[PDB]
Write a protein that binds this ligand. Structure first.
Ligand SMILES: Nc1nnc(OC2CCN(c3nnc(N)s3)CC2)s1
Ligand SMILES: Nc1nnc(OC2CCN(c3nnc(N)s3)CC2)s1
Lengths: 398, 402, 397, 404
């Protein structure tokens, strides 16, 4: 016995040869895409091969990659029937497509809508306008927070920022009662954690450090930059300057920080570009303890991915985050571009994008989707995996 | 094949009889106690079989076959380590370390002769462990606000109960307001909110009959372990409820009760509810019912709708520790509710419930030795609600093998 | 040479006989009524008696002639009194015809009345001045004045603050020192109600206030409407919340019967007045605590200062900041439609029209006090030397 | 009968000539100083007669007649005890007792964020020009926050009430919502808080550069002070450029909520604002500016009309409401006088229709007001019926220096 051989006739269907055309169709229906970084040496050893393969031919194509190839074919992934799962994701996408309401962030203008999924095991699925780039806006506030506590630790990062939400009373306060901004996912907090990344180095390269980091969160899928909104947020950041002058005056930055310099760095971070496919993977890195699901590299400390997931829950949808925490119970983060970065812990990462916002700042179709997501699957964080009434569980068989 | 015989050979050690005393000693090290309601038919058919032939007190596979035939689904999963904490007696030795951890924190002042302190656990499968002063009765005080919140949503549905009470915390600035921005109390775990949900249970009937309804409910949440009542603090808390009356009159003026509510009567019912007595063992089981989708773990009966036990666990997370709830939700992330008697009702979803009790409170109203305990609990096990079950650094996972 | 003789030829028109009827017409043009309380010995000793000579005259007015001199020497604080009333009539009628507003939940030729009584007793009314209505929280300064009159500034403010809330905070009960903000919001009024005459029963404290309001109005009309007493006992769920809140945060004097003080509070808010009556109470406040039509001392100078200071800052509920700016007069409104107005050192007034705006102020009342200071230099930070294009009725002209 | 002649015999004491030295000491005893701008033409014709015949310093009825012929309407009401404080030297000896009463109160610490023998001064100028100072009254110090009412007056004087309150409110904050910049109609609360003062700074004489409006404000302050000392201290101007991160924060917040007139350069307005905050005065100088506010906008020692009555009503009314930072509700109640303090140690005091004052001691309490200044203004209305809701008829055991 052993496993490169045993797996050969579970794909082979008893024949003595298998076309490679039925190996890839079998593998792409487990949810993996043939692009998968951890599948490289496997299909590196197959396009140089070219059409049926036999058990000698096969075995030294998959031997280095067969430990994970087995899980896809034994359906021991966290969503085993990933076919059933996507057709409900498509069904959720299409019911959100028909509620027109909202207006776009009027200082960035067929209109568009896309949602992408990437599981903690690398299973991938997109529908709609998934690789059209758009900026993160305040979607990036948890990522730069995660980076911060990854490099500095929980206690340093919260010497400078609090860890709770304000209250619908305090959408116009900057500081809490200990003279820290309330939390990392509101602008006053995001500016301060921007100040703590890679201190002592200049803003040209500490920006690059983040972009190195975002490249590791997306498994090196698309993370770009739009200079259009970088200058356009300097134009119309008179409020962000007030916060900076307020926090400078109230002694809230690490010592020797250049305040008006940090706010510039803040504006570039808010217009890093992604797509929903790219961003789904970074969401999935947060869903999986800080290990990127399509590369296997550990990107963020477990401490950082807990702290981040803890505050995207309470604070991630601006004033709608209390209603969110109640009715959907998933760590999520919205930004003004139309995106919502969604994390179902131990399952999946997601990015939904539709630019029309509501009257609180959340993608209108995005919010409808995440209600329907947890209306139908037991993904809320205070469901029980044993008794869950009339909703489905894609983590099990049929 | 068949499941009663193989279980014989899992315990029988190849020999052809088993002494009756070491079958239960095996089962008692699983974490279940021989008292388990779902084991009663098994031990009925075992100690009157103990005196059928009152010596030769060993069983053969036949006799065994129809002493465990009653509950052989649960008997196998106890002996095959398929409970959600399989090595339950390594786990307790860490619970014991955490008990003794907090035992040496002098601090606190009690709400107006040794140190009282106790913590009990009941897992989602019925496994139990207690340490310290676990069977001494004490009142729930605002520990009961989640339980009665669940009852409200169980009988009425989420959408009705929240026409009358909000679903978010106030803010650590507004710990002095009664109403939010929609003229509802902020949420079920503040007196103003709990008073209003008290008004929603069993409308149209008299207050004696709704009080019996709640306890009738609390008894099935606790698998019918101790649910009592202390009339001493009911009159002592009817004494000093001017603030709550202030809350009551404000809410009447702002039309915040259902139509036809007798407001001044509702407050008396509220003081009654706040001095229902429990122990750490009893409450331990109701926490575990919340830990288990609304099924009582030591009886198997359905107590609360999944809708209700989600809403409850979700607001015990946000709002459950008075002013310390954001700091709690961040550093331990477990649904909890403390009350002024010294209890903390703790839920690890899909694992266990707990009740820790030590009457000395800190300066926010939370049990001093309890808070120290629940920090170290998730400091030590990956039970935080946003840990990962795959990568979690130097922490232990009592849910798995080696 | 004595002053009854001196006053005699000033009236007599050179003749050596004077008709009695041209004397009262002369006296009514100074502003005083013939009913003036410190004028009665004069009008008693001529009502039993139609021309009179100098010995006839002398021994009817020696009685009161120190006060009669100033009416005829035009040394009253408003000397040309009918240029003055003639503008009050113009002010009264400009407010007439602004229909807007709605009445509270109390019980059809729609009513409006304003009366004035100067620091010298000169009086004038127009409209529905002799119809009774309740003070409501118009009474909050009067019971405050009583409290501080009997207890002193420092005791009374061990229990209540001395500033307005914030333009924001009419939905809080206490300030940051755990006192209600000030005596002219319900929470503050309840607690100063708690301080009147403590240790006695509530039937007797209510009589004590009524003894006192009888002295503030020179014994003019102060009655009571039990209809509105019952409606605030009925519809005071609000006030009970305040009482339990204040009882719970230790804000009453010791041995206070909380639920009893609130009933007493509801009684005080349903004391009836008219505009004429209340004009006098306003004028007592305008006059250093001396009732202008009796000469009796009613409130301590300390009390009438403290009171006048907070009707300025706090007297129109949420409109008191704008009020202090645009009219600058101590004033107090209540939900019945009244505004008790004080021009210090000049006059008191009471304006009453039941349609309110939606901050709680008589709509026609507020319009009137805008036009009043929009016309005379009665604002508290006008100058008595250069005052642009408006009137000063304190001089000749 | 002649209007110079009857006055001739009130001083001449029956004698037939008057020495120059007891006409002058008589006039100093009214409260006027002989420097008075509207009396200089009078002393022009006496300092020339002291040299025409070098000895025999005495005047005759005709010589006297046309030395005072010039200003005889004010000279008569000065010698006739027709000033609003007729016994001016009992009044000052009470001011001296109040000054000396406040001087032995140790408390306070100076704002030595911008720094031997304790400084303390108080000066008075009545609505009639009667003058009095004691202590450190001729030492320059900046207005700082004292200037917020004066430039507020200028704004509504040049623009009218409703325009100026198109951009700034007219009530106090409230001590719960005092750490906010805006109210509920998105205007700063009122002209006497930095947020409000910045906005009113933005409205003065727009369209011109900031140097020329600074010259305009100082032209204006000189006519409020009767052309006594109005200076500038560049040292604390630099100390306010360096410690203005809060004010820039205020500036950016207000720029984002559209709170300036259109075409305002916010960052320039902040610099103009810091300039205004370190205009220097002394207690004597500032005394006169207060007295202009006490007198319907007429400068009491020059007789010129400086501010519209509309402007000085509005100003006087908000110095009552808002002028003492967090202590203004307590102030308005216990002294009830329009006032403004600033962090330099000054309190600008107005008793309407009587006098203005400036008290200066740099040690502040823990709300920002002169310790010895506040002590002085309590004792002032403790002793005189100057509170704004006393009565001029019955006022218990208080003094009235306005009457005989
Ligand atoms: N939404 C709401 N509006 N108004 C409310 O009043 C409640 C009762 C009195 N309160 C206080 N008064 N004074 C203090 N120091 S707290 C505030 C809570 S809750
Ligand atoms: N209408 C409005 N007025 N003020 C607003 O917020 C401004 C900026 C931040 N502020 C804080 N003060 N104190 C804190 N801990 S944050 C208050 C000023 S909005």
């Amino acid at each position: 016995p052993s496993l490169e051989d045993l797996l050969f006739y579970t794909i082979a269907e008893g024949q003595e040869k298998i076309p490679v055309h039925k190996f890839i169709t079998a593998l792409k229906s487990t949810g993996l895409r043939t692009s998968d970084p951890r599948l490289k040496e496997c299909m590196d050893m197959l396009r140089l091969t070219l059409v049926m393969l036999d058990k000698d031919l096969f075995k030294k194509c998959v031997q280095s990659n067969i430990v994970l190839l087995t899980q896809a074919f034994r359906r021991k992934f966290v969503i085993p029937d990933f076919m059933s799962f996507t057709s409900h994701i498509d069904e959720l996408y299409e019911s959100a497509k028909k509620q027109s309401g909202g207006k776009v962030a009027d200082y960035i203008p067929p209109d568009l809508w896309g949602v992408s999924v990437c599981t903690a095991d690398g299973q991938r699925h997109s529908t709609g306008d998934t690789k059209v780039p758009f900026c993160l806006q305040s979607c990036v506030k948890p990522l730069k927070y995660a980076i911060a506590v990854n490099d500095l630790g929980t206690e340093y990062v919260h010497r400078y920022v609090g860890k709770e939400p304000s209250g619908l009373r305090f959408n116009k306060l900057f500081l809490n009662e200990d003279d820290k901004p309330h939390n990392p996912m509101v602008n006053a907090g995001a500016i301060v954690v921007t100040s703590l990344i890679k201190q002592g180095v200049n803003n040209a390269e500490k920006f690059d450090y983040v972009m190195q980091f975002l490249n590791k969160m997306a498994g090196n899928e698309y993370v770009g930059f739009s200079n259009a909104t970088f200058q356009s947020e300097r134009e119309s950041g008179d409020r962000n300057f007030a916060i900076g002058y307020y926090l400078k005056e109230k002694k809230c930055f690490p010592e020797g920080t250049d305040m008006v310099g940090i706010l510039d760095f803040y504006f570039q971070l808010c217009s890093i570009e992604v797509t929903c496919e790219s961003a789904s993977v970074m969401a999935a890195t947060l869903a999986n303890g800080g290990f990127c699901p399509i590369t296997g590299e550990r990107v963020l400390s477990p401490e950082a991915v807990r702290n981040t997931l803890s505050l995207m829950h309470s604070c991630g949808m601006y004033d709608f985050s209390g209603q969110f925490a109640f009715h959907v119970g998933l760590p999520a983060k919205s930004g003004v571009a139309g995106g919502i970065l969604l994390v179902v812990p131990n399952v999946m990462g997601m990015m939904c994008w539709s630019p029309p916002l509501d009257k609180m700042g959340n993608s209108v179709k995005g919010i409808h989707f995440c209600h329907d997501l947890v209306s139908l699957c037991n993904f809320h964080n205070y469901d029980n995996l044993r008794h869950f009434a009339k909703k489905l569980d894609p983590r099990r068989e049929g």
